[PDB]
Amino acid sequence: QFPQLDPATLAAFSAAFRGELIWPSDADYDEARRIWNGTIDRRPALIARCTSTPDVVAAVSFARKSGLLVAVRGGGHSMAGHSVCDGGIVIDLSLMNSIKVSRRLRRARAQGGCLLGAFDTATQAHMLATPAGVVSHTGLGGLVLGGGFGWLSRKYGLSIDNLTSVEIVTADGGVLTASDTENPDLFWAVRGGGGNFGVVTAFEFDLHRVGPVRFASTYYSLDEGPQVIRAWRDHMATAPDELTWALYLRLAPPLPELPADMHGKPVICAMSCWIGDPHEGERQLESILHAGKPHGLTKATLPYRALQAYSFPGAVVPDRIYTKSGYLNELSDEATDTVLEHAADIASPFTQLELLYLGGAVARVPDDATAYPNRQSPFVTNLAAAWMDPTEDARHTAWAREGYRALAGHLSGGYVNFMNPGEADRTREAYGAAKFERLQGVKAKYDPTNLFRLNQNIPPS
Amino acid sequence: QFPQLDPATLAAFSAAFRGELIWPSDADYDEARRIWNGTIDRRPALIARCTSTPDVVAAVSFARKSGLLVAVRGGGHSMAGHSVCDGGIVIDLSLMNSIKVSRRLRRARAQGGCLLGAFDTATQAHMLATPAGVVSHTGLGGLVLGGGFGWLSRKYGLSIDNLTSVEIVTADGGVLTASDTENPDLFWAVRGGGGNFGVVTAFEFDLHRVGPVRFASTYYSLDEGPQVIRAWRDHMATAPDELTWALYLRLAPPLPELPADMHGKPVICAMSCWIGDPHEGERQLESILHAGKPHGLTKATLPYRALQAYSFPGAVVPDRIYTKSGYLNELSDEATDTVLEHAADIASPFTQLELLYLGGAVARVPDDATAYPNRQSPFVTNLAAAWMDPTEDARHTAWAREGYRALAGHLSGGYVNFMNPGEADRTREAYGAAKFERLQGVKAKYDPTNLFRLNQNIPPS
Ligand SMILES: Cc1cc2nc3c(=O)[nH]c(=O)nc-3n(C[C@H](O)[C@H](O)[C@H](O)COP(=O)(O)OP(=O)(O)OC[C@H]3O[C@@H](n4cnc5c(N)ncnc54)[C@H](O)[C@@H]3O)c2cc1C
Ligand SMILES: Cc1cc2nc3c(=O)[nH]c(=O)nc-3n(C[C@H](O)[C@H](O)[C@H](O)COP(=O)(O)OP(=O)(O)OC[C@H]3O[C@@H](n4cnc5c(N)ncnc54)[C@H](O)[C@@H]3O)c2cc1C
Ligand SMILES: O=C(CC(=O)c1ccccc1)CC(=O)C(F)(F)F
Ligand SMILES: O=C(CC(=O)c1ccccc1)CC(=O)C(F)(F)F
């Protein structure tokens, strides 16, 4: 926490760095070191808030020279706690939030510290968008490096499927460009390979015109769980790419649109949207809403920016979280029953057992085209425990691990961006052997000393 | 646009500036010089995209030494076209979008180029907010310096009512902090006096906790205008601060929630929200939704960030705009009829005649406490023509001027941030004589040469 540093290499860093430095003695240190996963309580020797690419070069080089463990932070959403370290340096990108958008080229260049909501605001000024995650204050950086999925993904692919280049700072302090035509081996690896290869300071995306979206959210009783889940699974198998429909098993929020009868009881929350014409969307959504008897139905026609901002309306931000996630190639009636049993046990009002259906454009990309594994598995399930009181940690964590073990014969792979702090050992199985090995080769080339290891780490071959 | 610059002056600027320059021969120049108001077609000698406070110091000094007319650009929303100039320099802040939020202090520091949606994203990560306008890609900078109102204003005031300090670069290249206790004269003047005093590079705000908001929008036939507008004005006179209710008279958008037979015909779109508990909001919104026969009702409980992203769901971004706006102290039956007559003539599908009710917290601040005038007028009307085809300019512009002139006996003052490119002469009546004199005094002190004059301009002394 107070390691001895070399005064000469500290002063050279300071001279070369235009951003802000936050030391352990500083008033803002305890807030600056907090990340969204509040179970993670670590104490860096230094937080370096970078403001440009040359800042990130100076910070990488200073870390390498001084032997400080490197954490990189974009939006601080790491479910595994990777964006903070004990006794090392946090290369904190959160002030590097600039976005340039060309309407004529349908292109955006976003800095590596952007939040999604900043990005979506900027592109939507021109009625443009590209796929990203569903919660606005997530970081672009970590989300994209792992793949990135959300409402636009069935239609337009993963975030990475719209990424045309990056600017990246490597472990040796060099600044590279990677694209299809420049360092393409690195360009393959960053599209799914996390922060293993360097600090991405700029991302360039192709964009799509996305106008108003018909959206619906409704809640179903768990008494109708099997019918509603089976309807969802069957429907999604043949659904237009334009339809996205997700199920969140959770206690019913105390909202005025729901009867007070249901508040605080486990329910299915179904969220759906039509990426396309809203009149068509109204027809499509009406056709799926009666999977069970709907309660607390909200339907609206939203700019895409508002769809992105919608998830989720609650009164309190959860402090502590723990997640267990995997993909499924099929969701059987037996797995459905398992999901429903484990959902009925949910204790916290912030916890959700999520059932997502990807496929569509995501699955049309060939498997070997990027480092993102599992494109062909259309289901994702995430036991997303969240709560407030640290004395409850063992109970919440146990719930998520029990549900995972019960589902484990159905599950395959894992999204690197849903891994928890204990899941370092899941990397090889997440990627599979052929991808894991190709990534190790890229690692050997670009980060042979594994300078960047606070991630779902790929050691160099 | 191709002026002769001094090589020593230019070189000095180059050495001190770390942002991006855009020259007239560059491929991105025509896109970079476009502003939201597409009727404004100007060709600067240089666009300087600043990335830091020192960048702005360098651009200001360069402009002063070179005699280049200065445009300052935040989000580019100027109804008057002030953020681009022929032959001068645009000090372009749009890459200065960083925001730091302290949850524990309930404070945000935001750079002068931020978009609202970026700010709201950042504060909402903590369930915090402060008031700002209702269209997410508006710039923070110009909106705040003229006062800044939106959904949170009846409860929490203008943006400026939550401002605690600014960092500002003045005409002589100096960097100052202004606050209640530091350069307080300047701090008075920036709260409502526009960009007249310098380039604001950072704004610091107090924040509030703002959880889910109950929201409604519904459309009434314009045949019910008399009763709807009467209900609105009478209800708002005694309404809780928590209620905000605005009327947009427009052609009905072709949305699936509306019957096809109302598409494209004159209606009143009413939008309302309760800033407070959502069960209470449901009861309050239900009580006002029958001002006329409601059609196309949308009711939702939204995160405040989604409320901010909502305005407005349309499929096309209007290229050309023209606004005429004023305040009213009261809204008589005869003014009501005048508005309704003028609204029945609307031609473009993007044009709206807006009727806002402010009051609440905005009117509880003493009139002399900031440079914002007209606090005690609760009504704002804005004839906001918007269209696509340049051959239609004379027609749309006439509609707006005609409605304004018909209302002018009822109107007082004017919001500087709704002024059109032809309204330079409205500055003294907008502020009133005492405020305008005090502002000229502050101007003589901080901008004695009127270097910053692309704004609703206050000449010194
Ligand atoms: C509430 C919430 C909702 C989410 N929803 C979705 C969703 O809808 N879809 C989805 O796909 N994912 C989603 N996620 C998961 C998310 O993709 C991961 O948590 C992601 O890693 C977050 O990125 P970040 O920059 O915010 O996180 P951080 O904790 O800052 O970083 C995560 C990892 O990326 C690295 N990193 C970050 N920025 C850079 C960079 N610029 N260059 C190099 N390395 C970098 C870090 O070193 C770390 O290894 C969500 C997360 C949260 C917490
Ligand atoms: C679609 C739309 C919706 C709007 N809705 C609302 C609303 O709900 N509420 C409301 O109050 N207003 C609203 N407005 C009006 C708005 O407040 C003004 O248009 C505002 O001036 C825009 O600021 P900007 O930075 O985007 O514009 P710009 O055109 O970049 O700047 C406008 C003025 O401010 C100066 N300037 C900008 N940034 C700075 C800075 N950092 N320091 C010094 N000078 C600066 C410029 O020199 C210029 O004089 C809206 C505008 C638009 C176009
Ligand atoms: O739902 C998500 C995951 C998701 O990406 C998604 C959700 C709906 C539609 C498309 C994609 C965010 C979330 O709450 C999580 F906890 F899982 F992280
Ligand atoms: O009509 C508005 C709305 C506005 O400021 C407002 C709207 C609702 C509540 C409080 C304030 C401004 C705007 O976005 C426009 F450009 F059209 F003028």
Tab-separated table of C-alpha atoms in Angstrom, chain A residues 18 20 27 31 49 95 97-100 102-104 115 117-118 121 125-127 136-137 209 212 214 254-257 263 278-279 282 298-303 305-306 309-317 319, chain B residues 20 27 31 34 49 95 97-100 102-104 115 117-118 121 125-127 136-137 209 212 214 254-257 263 278-279 282 298-303 305-306 309-317 319:
chain	number	residue	atom	x	y	z
A	18	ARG	CA	-1.307	15.024	-17.309
A	20	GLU	CA	-4.763	12.940	-11.700
A	27	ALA	CA	-9.514	12.096	1.024
A	31	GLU	CA	-14.314	6.186	-2.765
A	49	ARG	CA	-6.711	8.689	-13.584
A	95	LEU	CA	-12.124	10.259	-17.324
A	97	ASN	CA	-15.136	9.353	-21.934
A	98	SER	CA	-14.936	11.122	-25.375
A	99	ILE	CA	-16.986	9.868	-28.366
A	100	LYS	CA	-16.713	11.194	-31.949
A	102	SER	CA	-19.623	10.613	-37.992
A	103	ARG	CA	-23.175	10.572	-39.336
A	104	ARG	CA	-21.901	10.318	-42.928
A	115	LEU	CA	-19.866	4.415	-20.029
A	117	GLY	CA	-24.931	5.714	-21.641
A	118	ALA	CA	-22.424	8.308	-22.785
A	121	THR	CA	-26.330	9.442	-25.984
A	125	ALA	CA	-27.957	12.369	-31.443
A	126	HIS	CA	-27.954	11.029	-35.026
A	127	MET	CA	-30.463	8.263	-34.484
A	136	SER	CA	-26.224	2.384	-18.887
A	137	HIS	CA	-23.409	2.810	-16.304
A	209	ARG	CA	-29.913	3.591	-37.759
A	212	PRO	CA	-38.199	4.140	-31.877
A	214	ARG	CA	-41.774	-0.949	-29.108
A	254	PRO	CA	-43.005	-2.862	-5.054
A	255	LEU	CA	-44.256	-0.940	-8.143
A	256	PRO	CA	-47.681	0.666	-8.574
A	257	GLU	CA	-48.357	-1.242	-11.771
A	263	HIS	CA	-44.978	-7.490	-3.976
A	278	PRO	CA	-43.151	-0.103	-33.992
A	279	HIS	CA	-46.444	-1.074	-35.563
A	282	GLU	CA	-46.925	-3.903	-31.268
A	298	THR	CA	-46.102	-1.633	-19.315
A	299	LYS	CA	-45.935	-1.071	-23.046
A	300	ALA	CA	-44.198	1.935	-24.559
A	301	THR	CA	-42.586	3.195	-27.808
A	302	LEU	CA	-39.086	4.398	-26.658
A	303	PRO	CA	-36.099	5.921	-28.376
A	305	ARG	CA	-31.488	5.599	-25.812
A	306	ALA	CA	-34.398	5.209	-23.366
A	309	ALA	CA	-31.569	3.491	-19.833
A	310	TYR	CA	-34.615	1.479	-18.644
A	311	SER	CA	-32.911	-1.475	-16.990
A	312	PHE	CA	-33.818	-1.729	-14.098
A	313	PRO	CA	-36.166	0.723	-12.122
A	314	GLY	CA	-35.364	0.246	-8.491
A	315	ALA	CA	-35.000	2.433	-5.447
A	316	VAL	CA	-31.641	1.159	-4.202
A	317	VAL	CA	-28.255	0.355	-5.790
A	319	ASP	CA	-23.731	-3.014	-2.759
B	20	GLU	CA	-7.204	17.929	-32.326
B	27	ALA	CA	-12.203	15.538	-44.755
B	31	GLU	CA	-19.359	17.455	-40.715
B	34	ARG	CA	-22.531	21.515	-38.705
B	49	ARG	CA	-11.141	20.316	-30.311
B	95	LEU	CA	-14.292	15.892	-26.351
B	97	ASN	CA	-17.060	14.960	-21.552
B	98	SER	CA	-15.586	13.614	-18.290
B	99	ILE	CA	-17.695	13.524	-15.102
B	100	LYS	CA	-16.586	12.691	-11.563
B	102	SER	CA	-18.865	11.457	-5.323
B	103	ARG	CA	-21.652	9.409	-3.793
B	104	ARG	CA	-20.667	10.329	-0.257
B	115	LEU	CA	-23.825	15.939	-23.073
B	117	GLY	CA	-27.065	11.969	-21.227
B	118	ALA	CA	-23.450	11.419	-20.264
B	121	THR	CA	-25.638	8.255	-16.857
B	125	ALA	CA	-24.946	5.073	-11.371
B	126	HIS	CA	-25.477	6.224	-7.739
B	127	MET	CA	-29.190	6.934	-8.021
B	136	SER	CA	-30.253	13.849	-23.756
B	137	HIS	CA	-27.815	15.119	-26.559
B	209	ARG	CA	-31.275	11.112	-4.748
B	212	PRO	CA	-37.926	5.588	-10.053
B	214	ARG	CA	-43.961	7.478	-12.454
B	254	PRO	CA	-47.737	7.771	-36.271
B	255	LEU	CA	-47.184	5.634	-33.111
B	256	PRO	CA	-48.967	2.260	-32.586
B	257	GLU	CA	-50.470	3.389	-29.296
B	263	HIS	CA	-52.058	10.126	-37.194
B	278	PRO	CA	-44.283	6.084	-7.488
B	279	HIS	CA	-47.490	4.996	-5.653
B	282	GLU	CA	-49.755	6.927	-9.830
B	298	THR	CA	-48.355	5.412	-22.030
B	299	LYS	CA	-47.761	4.973	-18.263
B	300	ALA	CA	-44.445	3.664	-16.958
B	301	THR	CA	-42.311	3.638	-13.824
B	302	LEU	CA	-38.872	4.689	-15.182
B	303	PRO	CA	-35.409	5.248	-13.796
B	305	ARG	CA	-32.081	8.310	-16.604
B	306	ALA	CA	-34.791	6.729	-18.816
B	309	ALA	CA	-33.701	9.724	-22.500
B	310	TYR	CA	-37.401	9.605	-23.462
B	311	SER	CA	-37.951	12.982	-25.151
B	312	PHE	CA	-38.958	12.420	-27.986
B	313	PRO	CA	-39.613	9.005	-29.786
B	314	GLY	CA	-39.454	9.898	-33.485
B	315	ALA	CA	-37.910	8.187	-36.445
B	316	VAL	CA	-36.288	11.235	-38.064
B	317	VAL	CA	-33.947	13.984	-36.789
B	319	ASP	CA	-32.461	19.334	-39.918
